[PDB]
Ligand binder design. Sequence first.
Ligand SMILES: Nc1ccn([C@@H]2O[C@H](COP(=O)(O)O)[C@@H](O)[C@H]2O)c(=O)n1
Ligand SMILES: Nc1ccn([C@@H]2O[C@H](COP(=O)(O)O)[C@@H](O)[C@H]2O)c(=O)n1
Lengths: 390, 390
Amino acid sequence: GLAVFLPPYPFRGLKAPYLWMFYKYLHCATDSILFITGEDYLSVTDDEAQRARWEFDPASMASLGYELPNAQSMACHEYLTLDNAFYETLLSRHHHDPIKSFSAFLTERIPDLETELHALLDSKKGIIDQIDTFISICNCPSLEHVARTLGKEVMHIEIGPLRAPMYRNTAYLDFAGVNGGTEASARYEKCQAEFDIKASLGDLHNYFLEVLPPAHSAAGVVLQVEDDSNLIAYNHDFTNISLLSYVRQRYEKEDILVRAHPGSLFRLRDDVFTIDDSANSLAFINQCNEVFTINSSVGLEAILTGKKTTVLGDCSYAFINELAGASATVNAAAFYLFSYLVPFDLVFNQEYLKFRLGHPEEREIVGKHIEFYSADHSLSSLINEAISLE
Amino acid sequence: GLAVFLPPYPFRGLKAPYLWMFYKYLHCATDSILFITGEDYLSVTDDEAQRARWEFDPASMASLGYELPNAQSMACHEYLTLDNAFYETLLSRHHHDPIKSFSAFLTERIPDLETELHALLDSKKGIIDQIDTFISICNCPSLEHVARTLGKEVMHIEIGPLRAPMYRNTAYLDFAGVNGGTEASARYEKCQAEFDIKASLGDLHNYFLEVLPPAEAATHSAAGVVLQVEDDSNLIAYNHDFTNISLLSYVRQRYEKEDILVRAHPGSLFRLRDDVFTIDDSANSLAFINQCNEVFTINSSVGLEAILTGKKTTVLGDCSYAFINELAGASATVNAAAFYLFSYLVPFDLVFNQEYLKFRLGHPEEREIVGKHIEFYSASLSSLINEAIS
Ligand SMILES: Nc1ccn([C@@H]2O[C@H](COP(=O)(O)O)[C@@H](O)[C@H]2O)c(=O)n1
Ligand SMILES: Nc1ccn([C@@H]2O[C@H](COP(=O)(O)O)[C@@H](O)[C@H]2O)c(=O)n1
């Protein structure tokens, strides 16, 4: 079975931070799952003070394709719960800075965590050999170290850069890391000769677009959520304010359009920059000549719509932007969209997960994904035909 | 099949640094092996400007239990060879410091290396699917990153802390790391209840000794200092910044020179002048330890030896046996040392035995591992060890 790692540590001040993934795996479950998580994930539904959480919003449920679990759904699965005394102790060892503690969690081994993980997995004999793979929503060298000792793989799985309602829902699935330390460029370089796609970047974009496009600054600045893992561990020290300064070296304010992340706690004053108030990020980038980002999903959007895009942080799609030719870029973007990204529902499907655990060929992977997208032959022929059929 | 990684990079100034492991795997091969190495490893045996190397010394060959390979032995296997152009670039990227370059190789991902490893593995079709596991003589996050992407384990394998002629030959086998980042303590914490050993510390030592221990020494020094090879990976990456000279300084903070007995590593390029420290000239490290009341080390194999003789031991670097030293009780120390010697350590010949390697690759219970080892040494878990100690 699956072992799904969903840590309770409230690095960003929220209990059960990964609750949506917990609910999605429960809803799409076909077999018993081992959940390595916290007690908060189980008691959140009866906590009256948390009922305004977006995970309980029917619009969010419908968008991500899950419904709330009942006692019956819960009982089908096994649970190991992590203790909070470690989180306090973790904070203690990082000057009580929860963000730097989060950074350590993402990028460093933590012996105490490894110990507790080993003890939990051993708490019931048989558990370890039932495990076919670990799943984690984030990079975690503590878990990954434990996994090597036990001979288990770690799939890193997260909602992707293209999301409903603007796009078909996508997801990341990466054996090495998600967002940071990804294997997308390595996978592409191995199979790049198989990609000869007769389309433009905009044609690729259109395939994933689910809506009629919205239909004039030189510089567009994409801002992100300030305490996102992307801006904590994978940012190359860049922040929203230093990204702005970067762009301000290169442009006068009259040529700068800034869009804050809707999910941010902060937003711009309207005295100094021209502030974007578009209804979506696509309408925002469409007004810009070139786009600047650290490692936002919107960076990929900019690339697919043909805009010159600057990416200052580490991210899974950055290698697409580093290629010189237009044809080379299209082929890389096609691999990324059709083989690296996964149809969202599939990374919660145990049959698909077992398929990927076998480490099949890129051709098979693309075949599976297009089969899903076309729910309604060479690799390049598959993609070209899919694009043509629309 | 096995994939054995033996890098050609001459960090310490010597071509084909891991030549002995190459020859040993060739000798004990029972199936075709994939060697990821350098062409320096292939040309040395008939390069007669290289005759004076220790790997060709009949004493070394007998001691490690191998013979030189002939042309027919070589032809049984597959070879992928790494380019030197990367090494030069690696050096220029680390201020032309070969030692700090070695450190990065040991502790950091190197994108260029990963690209080449992926290209070599992908060079000829069929190779990756026939790999059961990678084997590396050292930590290498570049290789380990590649292995995650391909879904393969990495066994870290090296000669152990107990070696002939003084002891039975032992080896390390560790899925997480060798010397640094080891999984010894994690494995022990998981199974420590199974180790209730009713034998003395001396009984354990005696089991591994091939010779009788030295008689009670006339005259004892208060403090013994173990020096190591200055550019050993243990003093480069796993030393916690300690060096031979800072270790000496450490002890001098606690002892007058007249109470200090220092033993240089026989393999070192350097040795102490004759007039400031009392210099050891014992026939072996065991006779040296015997003259000391307590022993100080960074992370030498001799540290384990001091522990096995019941001497108070200070360990300043990271190493696999350190967790033994951190216990308070003598009986608890015995139990842990028993796990270490019989389950963590492997009989030397077996780590070159493909059947044994496939056994470990199945991640069997500790009881099974101990049984396999004792079976070799003899030519409940505790009762099996208790009886062996005899
Ligand atoms: N400046 C921004 C950043 C993100 N977003 C929205 O948030 C989604 C996720 O973006 P991030 O990867 O930056 O968090 C985008 O696909 C987009 O819909 C936005 O609308 N404006
Ligand atoms: N100061 C030292 C260090 C090592 N040695 C020898 O070298 C072997 C390997 O030790 P290292 O781990 O320090 O390299 C020891 O088992 C011992 O035989 C020694 O004789 N004197």
